[PDB]
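Wed. Picked up where I left off yesterday with Spectrin alpha chain, brain. The coffee machine is broken again, so keeping this brief.
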Amino acid sequence: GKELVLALYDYQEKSPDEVTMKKGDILTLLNSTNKDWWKVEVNDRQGFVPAAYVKKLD
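Structure written out below (tokens, as returned):
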């Protein structure tokens, strides 16, 4: 499994443990154990984004 997610909306980081993404970005999923905040990797940065702002691609 590739563990990819698609950004549904832009998100601006508000804390240093978050990441910024743009709608249409394809992120790597690291940890989806929390229902509200998922840890993702977008290039060379890792951090949290809201789960509701992304969709798992398979």
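Quick read: The chain has no helices and five strands.
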